[PDB]
Amino acid sequence: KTNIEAYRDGLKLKTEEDFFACDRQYVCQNYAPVPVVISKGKGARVWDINGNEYYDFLAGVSSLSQGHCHPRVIAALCRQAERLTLTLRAFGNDVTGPACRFMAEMFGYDRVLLMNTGAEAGESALKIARKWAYEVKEIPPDSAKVILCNNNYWGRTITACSSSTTFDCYNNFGPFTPGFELIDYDDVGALEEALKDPNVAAFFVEPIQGEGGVNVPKPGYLKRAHELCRSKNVLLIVDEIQTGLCRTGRLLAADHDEVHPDILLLGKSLSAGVVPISAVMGRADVMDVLKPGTHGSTFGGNPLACAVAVEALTVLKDEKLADRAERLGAQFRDCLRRELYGKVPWIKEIRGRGLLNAVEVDSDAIDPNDVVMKLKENGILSKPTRGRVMRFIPPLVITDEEHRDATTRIIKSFLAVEEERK
Amino acid sequence: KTNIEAYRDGLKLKTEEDFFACDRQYVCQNYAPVPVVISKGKGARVWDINGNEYYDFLAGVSSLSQGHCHPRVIAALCRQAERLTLTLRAFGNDVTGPACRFMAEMFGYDRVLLMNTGAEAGESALKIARKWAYEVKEIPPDSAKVILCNNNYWGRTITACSSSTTFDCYNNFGPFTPGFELIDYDDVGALEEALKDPNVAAFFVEPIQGEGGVNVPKPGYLKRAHELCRSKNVLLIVDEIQTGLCRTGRLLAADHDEVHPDILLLGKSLSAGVVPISAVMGRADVMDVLKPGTHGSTFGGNPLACAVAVEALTVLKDEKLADRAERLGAQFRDCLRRELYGKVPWIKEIRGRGLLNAVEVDSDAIDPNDVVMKLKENGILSKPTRGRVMRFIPPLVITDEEHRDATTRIIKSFLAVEEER
Ligand SMILES: *Cc1c(COP(=O)(O)O)cnc(C)c1O
Ligand SMILES: *Cc1c(COP(=O)(O)O)cnc(C)c1O
Incomplete structure (x- = not known):
């Protein structure tokens, strides 16, 4: 039909x-x-x-x-879709705010930025970390560095390609966005050495490397990383787009180390696979660098996806x-x-x-x-x-x-x- | 509730x-x-x-x-959502292929790449142009340039900020992606000078600048630009994310000039505002530089969005x-x-x-x-x-x-x- x-x-x-x-x-x-x-x-x-x-x-x-x-997620999609799917963040609506509140309280953050894809969530976190480094840390213009790990995966934009060590991901897609220092994954000594540069804005890491091969780090890795970063006033950006939302046996894989990410990323199962919605969350004095007009997205935070996300998140809890x-x-x-x-x-x-x-x-x-x-x-x-x-x-x-x-x-x-x- | x-x-x-x-x-x-x-x-x-x-x-x-x-679009969403919403492109399904054929035939292109947002469509097009320039034009490593216009808008990624002239879009988000040459909009002479650099891969342009202020260029602009790009074997990437899909009184705003973009971008109303789905379309010898593993997206081309897009696109036609x-x-x-x-x-x-x-x-x-x-x-x-x-x-x-x-x-x-x- x-x-x-x-x-x-x-x-x-x-x-x-x-x-x-x-x-x-x-x-x-x-x-x-x-x-x-x-x-x-x-x-x-x-x-x-x-x-x-x-x-x-x-x-x-x-x-x-x-x-x-999942019947609940599908019912929430279809009920909201009959009412209202898109306003833009140019106009208020009766869903976006409450959904951001729901997420803020569930994960323990001051501010929630809703985007569409995991790659958009990573892009937005890097922009936040840079603008924060420039305006709050007051490091020199254009000099912000972000530390990432070998075999990381955060998506397919040119800036993600520019921070990748996977041949197929970057080959023939340059010239590349500057500002990235790659260190080995699961290597605290290499992180500590990279953190000597006072131009570092952020360390961007997966609790377990997903696309890189389900690489589980040594006990204490993330806890130790976070302490090193705090001691240098460097933001720990933790990508939980693949590891988060109950997949590893905890709400966030970061919980295994009792780490609260300075910036958290969620996506993927945030929607139960129904529509693309991703999230960047952080404390007020970090997230608030994104002033009106400095960042945006047509579909980011649209009321349909928000309705789906709150249902999808609730299923995680209800079904244990x-x-x-x-x-x-x-x-x-x-x-x-x-x-x-x-x-x-x-x-x-x-x-x-x-x-x-x-x-x-x-x-x-x-x-x-x-x-x-x-x-x-x-x-x-x-x-x-x-x-x-x-x-x-x-x-x-x-x-x-x-x-x-x-x-x-x-x-x-x-x-x-x-x-x-044989 | x-x-x-x-x-x-x-x-x-x-x-x-x-x-x-x-x-x-x-x-x-x-x-x-x-x-x-x-x-x-x-x-x-x-x-x-x-x-x-x-x-x-x-x-x-x-x-x-x-x-x-739109009731037809919402009915399409709901029917498909009860059956299948995501497989990834790692597995086949009974929707993605047919929806891409629908699109290929409606817009007259060999290959359709489906992504989620307009920004992702732009990113994907820039990747294709760069890789094609390296592999088919054989321009030297890291030397690809892309021309675009002052006051352009194509999204909020770092690479989009790197190619913006709007202070609030780019300020304090650097360092920036190299390889962009900004010229005035609606200026054919400036385009012609910029095309002298043989490392150009593409000219990236809106038929009418959207966020830039609904800047309607002079008669013949797009037609003249396409001819200059062909003269130099440069790809014309036309962003119709805002202007396309009947908004300007033609299926594509490019149609006003009888221009068939070498790479076309659609987004926004491609879904009737229901879910984010965007598209990059082009000829086979251009689009096929995206080999397995070289590009992807979790939600790009998901069956739910496909079913939505096809209904959305049929509405545009059916309702004239x-x-x-x-x-x-x-x-x-x-x-x-x-x-x-x-x-x-x-x-x-x-x-x-x-x-x-x-x-x-x-x-x-x-x-x-x-x-x-x-x-x-x-x-x-x-x-x-x-x-x-x-x-x-x-x-x-x-x-x-x-x-x-x-x-x-x-x-x-x-x-x-x-x-x-
Ligand atoms: C899949 C993935 C992404 C990107 O998400 P998309 O929605 O496909 O852009 C980012 N980070 C991690 C860790 C992922 O697994
Ligand atoms: C809105 C817009 C985009 C970006 O699309 P998003 O889905 O918001 O990322 C790109 N190009 C043009 C011409 C637009 O109007």
Whole structure:
């Protein structure tokens, strides 16, 4: 009945290959997808166009923590969408303020800036940190530096490309925005050395590196980093777009170290995967550098996304998804270590916190894509990062039985690829 | 009651003032909003929390061309939202491909890249142009230049600030992304000189500058610019995020000059103001420089936004909103000119195309905000740009009866402010 449905009917796409070809012909070819055509999602499950069921073990890289099509989130979208979707922040409305209050109180910050994407949240935090460094720290104009880590990921703008160490992310996209010092991740001594520069405005870091391969730092990393930064009046910007909102077994992964970020970033599951909405939060004397006219966005803070975000955030609490991720995650890692370590020599490491988990394989010893195909053959959808880091990031709403079943299927896939190697 | 409704009820916010104080306390204060508290929108109209009606003459700066809460668009949102909203482009789905084909065919391009915001579309276009210049033009490493115009606006990223001449956009946000050459808008000679640098990858331009003040260039500008760029193998990137999608009385504002942009940007009304979705479109040999892993976005091309965009775009066609914009916009400029030129001396110029109109005032002879308040007294909601440029950007679905009424109301507001002068 709707225009997309009717247009699609007219195209007579029956087979999965009919869709792959449509995609190849008309869609900018900047992804290499897994060959599946998903048509429905609910909770931890998706179905392809043929009625085949899978567990979704990417979940939007932790954008779907609440599950696909969560009924409450969908009801809140549809109720608000019938009333009002967009005013701009040029006009007041009856949603944006309350939603920013809800977030401010939930995370403990004076001010909430709403943007659309995670990359926009990072851009906005860097602009805040620079303008603050210039106007409050009074460092010389154009000299602000931001420290970031090797293999960081914060998105795909030119400034993010300019602060990346991933070849594909920056190659042939220059010239680059200046002002970035890259240090190793999970290395406190290198941070301490970089903090000797009094031009540093901020250290920008992930509690666990997401795209970089689910890299879990050593105990105390973030606590120690924060102390170093405070002692130099340098802002700690913590990117929780992938790690935040219950994924690691706590509300924020920073909580594991009892760290309250000077600037916090949220996105992804902030909307339960329904619409793009991201947040930058911080104390008043930092956030208030963004005076009227100095920053903006058409859709940032639109009342529809705000309504969705408050529902999505409430589901996290009501369904105790932090406790669920903590419990199931510990079990997943325990299972895989028990049944795969030793028996599968080409597994380099099994790592994670909560339900942010990875199995790094040795890509010289095995074709990583065999594991991906095999997993799919056994009803598990995932996409690696860096070729060799297999990722297991299911929605947090995955039931005990679904998780047990999935774990069994996942173990079986690795063993099957190992058998096949013989 | 959904969570936002129950939470808000608990805050006991009754007056407009209660809402403004809530904003000042919790919302990052990077806007100076007009004092109205909008609760609902329908078509060209909105209502505040006390049930006062207004005409929306900002329309999301042309994000709501289809009106607030277009029933077909909202029905499309809701139907798709029950089925599937996000897969990532890491997995296929049954929506993204067909929506991109729909777009490719409607606008006549080989490849469609879907992103979320207008800024992201601009970023993506600059990346494509730079990479193409390096890989196809073979210009030296890090040497790509992009030409754009004074008073341009394409967003708020650091790289957008780095290429702005607006003090508030860029001030204290550096150091800046290199590789930009700013020239005057609506100046073909300046473009021709700038194109002498063989390291230019692209000229990035708006068919009418939006935030810059609804600056309508001289006849032939875009046509002449495209020819100069082709002469030098430079890409013409046309930002139609504000001007496109029937706003100026044509499908694309570029159509006024019969210009097919080498890279086209859409955004805003691409979703009828319902969810952020933006698009970058271009020929295959340009767009295919974005190889797997070289660009991405979590929400870019998500199925929900696709279903919305297709419905949004079908509305524009089905409701003949280009013809509506042409016809009403001409009637608007003619009435304002006839009743305001000569009678109101502080109006510098009345200008626009279609329903992208502006009235620039002289702010040494009048307070800009007096006009804005009298408009609001008279039921017309607008926000100027650059202080002195009043903007009249209603939804295109505004009825004949509603548009005559609004036109009377705006004329009455300028005349009342002149009387009070
Ligand atoms: C995915 C991601 C981003 C960027 O979010 P987009 O919404 O895709 O721009 C930023 N930071 C981290 C840690 C992420 O995982
Ligand atoms: C509003 C606008 C943009 C930016 O779009 P956002 O979605 O606000 O980032 C870019 N270009 C033009 C011409 C615009 O009017």
